[PDB]
Paper text:
Dihydrofolate reductase reduces dihydrofolic acid to tetrahydrofolic acid using reduced nicotinamide adenine dinucleotide phosphate (NADPH) as the electron donor. While this reaction is catalyzed by the enzyme dihydrofolate reductase (DHFR) in mammals and other organisms, some bacteria have an alternative pathway for reduced folate biosynthesis using FolM alternative di­hydrofolate reductase 1. Here, we present the crystal structures of FolM alternative dihydro­folate reductase 1 from two Brucella species, B. suis (BsFolM) and B. canis (BcFolM). BsFolM and BcFolM are 95% identical in sequence.
The interface interactions are mostly hydrogen bonds and other nonbonded contacts. The tetramers are similar and superpose with an r.m.s.d. of ∼0.5 Å. Each monomer has the extended double-Rossmann fold of NADPH-dependent SDRs with a central seven-stranded parallel β-sheet sandwiched between two pairs of three α-helices. Both the BsFolM and BcFolM structures were co-crystallized with a cofactor (NADPH). The BsFolM and BcFolM structures are in the closed conformation with ordered substrate-binding loops, as observed in protozoan pteridine reductases. Apart from this loop region, the cofactor-binding cavity is very similar in these enzymes. Furthermore, the residues involved in NADPH binding are well conserved. While the substrates of BsFolM and BcFolM are unknown, their substrate-binding cavities are large enough to accommodate the inhibitors identified by rational therapeutics discovery for human African trypanosomiasis and Chagas disease.
Residue numbers in the entry: 6 to 254
Write the structure that this text describes.
């Protein structure tokens, strides 16, 4: 076989900032060729790619709107670094809505970025990946799919759908492509979160600590390195999904 990292081109969606960037830089530093997909963060993406290449790694930037036609995205990437073998579906939209005031326009976007696009890209990767190569899809989801609540209604349904799809994609794409997932908990402040709000939330986690950014790339590599694993998720969440103390107790 030939599963050495130099022969495992990676596509990370929304890879130019924050968690996506941490994954990109971890994989690139371990010798994976990496395609950094981005949209609004082109400047950042190019900077990351330049640094990797100057350090002797292998990186490129691809640009696409994951709510438009994404049927060309895998090919943009493979044209640069070779057939995509490891797909990280990291890109996301995290907007609040609730029952009683649902806007089907925002609903549609959530399902576009978290469900439609990841499935389409997994489909496209499979079609283009040579038959003598095994592949891996890692979906970046959200710990809340393991502890359902009514907040962020359409967001939550779209992320939970991605977790459901992690199972059914794993079943559909086996044996050649494995599909696993990471469910982050509080990792970086969520735009609507001030630092104090983030720190307080973390202090309330069962483990009282946030996942460290290196854990994300380590987990992608863990899935890559242990070939008996498919259809499964690790919550890098400080135990958030196991929180249990509700007012009724
Ligand atoms: N941060 C946390 O603590 C946390 C907690 C739970 C779950 N998660 C999940 O972990 C993953 C990473 O978190 P994050 O906070 O780092 O994500 P993010 O910053 O909110 O966004 C990541 C990327 O998604 C891309 N994106 C969104 N819509 C796009 C579109 N139509 N077309 C192309 N790109 C689009 C963007 O790329 P461009 O910027 O280039 O446009 C954006 O940079 C996400 O899936 C998130 O849902 C994170």
């Amino acid at each position: 076989e030939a599963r050495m990292v130099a022969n495992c081109p990676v596509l990370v969606t929304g890879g130019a900032r924050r968690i996506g960037k941490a994954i990109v830089e971890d994989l690139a530093s371990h010798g994976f060729p990496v395609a950094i997909h981005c949209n609004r963060s082109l400047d950042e993406g190019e900077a990351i790619a330049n640094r990797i290449n100057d350090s002797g790694g292998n990186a490129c930037v691809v640009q696409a709107d994951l709510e438009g036609d994404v049927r060309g995205l895998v090919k943009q990437a493979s044209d640069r670094i070779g057939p995509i073998r490891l797909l990280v579906n990291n890109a996301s939209l995290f907007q609040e809505d609730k029952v009683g005031a649902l806007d089907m326009a925002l609903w549609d976007r959530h399902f576009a970025v978290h469900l439609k696009t990841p499935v389409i890209l997994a489909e496209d990767m499979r079609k283009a990946l040579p038959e003598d190569q095994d592949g891996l899809v890692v979906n970046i989801i959200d710990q809340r799919v393991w502890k359902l609540n009514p907040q962020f209604f359409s967001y939550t349904l779209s992320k939970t759908a991605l977790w459901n799809a992690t199972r059914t994609l794993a079943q559909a794409l086996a044996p050649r492509i494995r599909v696993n997932a990471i469910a982050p908990g509080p990792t970086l402040p969520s735009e609507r979160q001030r630092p104090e709000d983030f720190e307080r939330q973390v202090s309330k986690l069962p483990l009282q600590r946030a996942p460290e950014l290196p854990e994300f790339g380590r987990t992608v590599r863990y899935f890559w390195e242990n070939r008996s694993i498919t259809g499964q998720m690790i919550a890098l969440d400080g135990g958030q999904h196991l929180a249990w103390e509700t007012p009724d107790i």
